[PDB]
Amino acid sequence: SGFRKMAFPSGKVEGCMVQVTCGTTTLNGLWLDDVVYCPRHVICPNYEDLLIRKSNHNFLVQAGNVQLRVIGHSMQNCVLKLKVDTANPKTPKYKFVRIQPGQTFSVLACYNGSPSGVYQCAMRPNFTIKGSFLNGSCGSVGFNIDYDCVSFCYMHHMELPTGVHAGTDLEGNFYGPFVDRQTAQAAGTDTTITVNVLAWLYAAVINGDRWFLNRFTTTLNDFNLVAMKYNYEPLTQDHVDILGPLSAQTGIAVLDMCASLKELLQNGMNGRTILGSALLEDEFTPFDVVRQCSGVTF
Amino acid sequence: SGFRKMAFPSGKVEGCMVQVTCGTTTLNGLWLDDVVYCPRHVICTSEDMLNPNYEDLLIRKSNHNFLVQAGNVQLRVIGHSMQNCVLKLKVDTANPKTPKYKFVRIQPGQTFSVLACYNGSPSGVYQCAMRPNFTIKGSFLNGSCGSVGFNIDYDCVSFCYMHHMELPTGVHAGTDLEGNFYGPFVDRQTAQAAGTDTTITVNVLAWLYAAVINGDRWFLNRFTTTLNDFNLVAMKYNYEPLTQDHVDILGPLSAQTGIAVLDMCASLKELLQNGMNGRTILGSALLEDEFTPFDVVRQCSGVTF
Ligand SMILES: O=C(Nc1cncc2ccccc12)[C@@H]1CN(S(=O)(=O)NC2CC2)Cc2ccc(Cl)cc21
Ligand SMILES: O=C(Nc1cncc2ccccc12)[C@@H]1CN(S(=O)(=O)NC2CC2)Cc2ccc(Cl)cc21
Ligand SMILES: [Cl-]
């Protein structure tokens, strides 16, 4: 029993965190094999012009108490790749993956190449993440673990004026219409991740919270007409299919749970909570619910 | 900016998790140096749990009855002893991944990270607090026994909790790493129930100071309170009494934001009376009590917005 915002064990990622210094700027890098990946803004813009003026010895890379020697450098999109003389003996099995809005991941927040905390979050529909980051956190990474393989999906680059965060995949492509520079940028209007709220409602039913269930069912079309009015993302047939297993475990059809969600949007919770929350939670995917209510290990 | 329920990086603890098997029971153990620590109920059957005599069950066991698996390697048990509700298994190999560590017993209100494990394999990490009723609101399934709670302030891991059981309300009970239970619980399947829980007042105040640091003041008012008047009101909402120790502990957050502890207590009194009126505080529509004053100082900026 119980339901917590659970992150993946961070050990495999901790063994890859390093400190990268270029002039006056210090941030975090990810050391995999003989390459250190970090945000290109460490050299700060005309990034090619700024980079051509730097030599290998201008980049100071520190792994624990050891100084790594930079023997090459190149840029890939908004990520700087520093070739080092030493391969990371702690390099786990890994892949670089680009995630979609709604998908969740764990963040290992780091400062000066030293991990300070781990938390779980989701890529919002507006491509920002509601993280917890201070100055020096740039280069901190987001990831998932599937079996023994770490899938790196996010690298932190910046904080927007509303306090939310923006970054790139590990190939340097930003999530969202953001650019790595000081200019007027703002998060777009966000929406609620509908398939995730439904997954969390199924988790509540698995945990014994059933007060919100009703005898009614709805159609996908009627549900989406209602959901669009509360700034909820449209629910697709793919989302309905993805919720199939949770629907079979609890005996509540997806459009049956949509009728429950419809009533919660129109009438509120009326002083009640669901899994200890007075808000409808959208940062647990259907897969996160299945994994936490099954005990999958790494 | 931002405020998340943040856990400590779990790597130092992951390298200590092992699987302990005794007959048909399999659970988790913590391997530090040449000793594996695990709940003593690993020696019990389900029938035994009603009224187990651990001393009688243990005397019938030899070292080779305990199977300890660390990754893909079988460790050899060369000794065993019981200390309160934990079993200590001496093994023939010291853990090369043993971090710098201490065993610490925490008080209600204190927070810690939990590395939930099954079959000696870590599955997830989450942050939680020792409730005033000595239970923890964890997320644990069958096989999670022996999973541990810890803090890692600096490079040293302070182990404070080992998971033993789930109570009828779905909350969890366990021991410190010396085998002493938190709360009036026994590692026996008898009529046991969590006492009525209360809200950790000093933690809610800390979280209100975190909201001020991150730039939000809508909940403040022009009033103050005496400590006694605050406690008379707080106890009506099932909030723990606020002591002078708690007031002293909130001193640094009070100096950083410029808001006296008793003025923040006045704001809390008003929030309890009025609710939030459609508003949120740090993305929550409830008053959060699982962040200590120390956690707020660790996570939040040193400069108020
Ligand atoms: O955003 C960035 N860093 C951070 C990242 N995360 C959490 C921070 C918290 C507190 C201060 C910085 C933080 C950096 C530096 N700054 S800044 O001048 O500090 N303005 C930020 C407060 C809004 C602009 C900037 C511009 C472009 C790029 Cl790619 C990076 C960045
Ligand atoms: O509680 C225990 N295990 C668990 C521990 N944590 C989370 C669990 C979730 C789901 C199932 C087990 C879980 C064990 C086994 N059980 S039991 O028969 O499974 N009853 C509990 C569910 C209410 C009695 C018992 C009694 C005393 C002691 Cl010391 C240990 C234990
Ligand atoms: Cl304590």
UniProtKB/Swiss-Prot annotation, chain A:
Location comes to:
Host cytoplasm; Host Golgi apparatus; Host nucleus
Peptidase C30 domain location is 1-298
Q: Where's the Glycyl lysine isopeptide (Lys-Gly) (interchain with G-Cter in ubiquitin) crosslink?
A: K5, K83
Which residues are catalytic? H41 (for 3cl-pro activity), C138 (nucleophile)
Give the recorded effect for C138A. Answer: Complete loss of 3C-like proteinase nsp5 cleavage
Q: Mutating Q182A leads to what result?
A: Does not affect ability to cleave and inactivate human TRMT1
Catalytic activity annotated for this protein?
TSAVLQ-|-SGFRK-NH2 and SGVTFQ-|-GKFKK the two peptides corresponding to the two self-cleavage sites of the SARS 3C-like proteinase are the two most reactive peptide substrates. The enzyme exhibits a strong preference for substrates containing Gln at P1 position and Leu at P2 position
Activity regulation reads: Inhibited by pyridone-containing alpha-ketoamides compounds 13a and 13b. In turn, alpha-ketoamide 13b (tert-butyl (1-((S)-1-(((S)-4-(benzylamino)-3,4-dioxo-1-((S)-2-oxopyrrolidin-3-yl)butan-2-yl)amino)-3-cyclopropyl-1-oxopropan-2-yl)-2-oxo-1,2-dihydropyridin-3-yl)carbamate) inhibits SARS-CoV-2 replication in human lung cells. Inhibited ex vivo by michael acceptor inhibitor N3. Inhibited ex vivo by compound 11a and 11b.
Residue ranges annotated as Cytoplasmic topological domain: 1-298
What subunit structure does UniProt give?
Answer: 3CL-PRO exists as monomer and homodimer. Only the homodimer shows catalytic activity. Interacts with host FBXO22; this interaction promotes the proteasomal degradation of nsp5.
Q: Explain the purpose of this protein.
A: Cleaves the C-terminus of replicase polyprotein at 11 sites. Recognizes substrates containing the core sequence [ILMVF]-Q-|-[SGACN]. Cleaves and inactivates human TRMT1, preventing tRNA guanine(26)-dimethylation of tRNAs. May cleave human NLRP1 in lung epithelial cells, thereby activating the NLRP1 inflammasome pathway. May cleave human GSDMD, triggering alternative GSDME-mediated epithelial cell death upon activation of the NLRP1 inflammasome, which may enhance the release interleukins 1B, 6, 16 and 18. Also able to bind an ADP-ribose-1''-phosphate (ADRP).
Q: Can you name this protein? A: 3C-like proteinase nsp5
Species this protein is from: Severe acute respiratory syndrome coronavirus 2 (2019-nCoV)
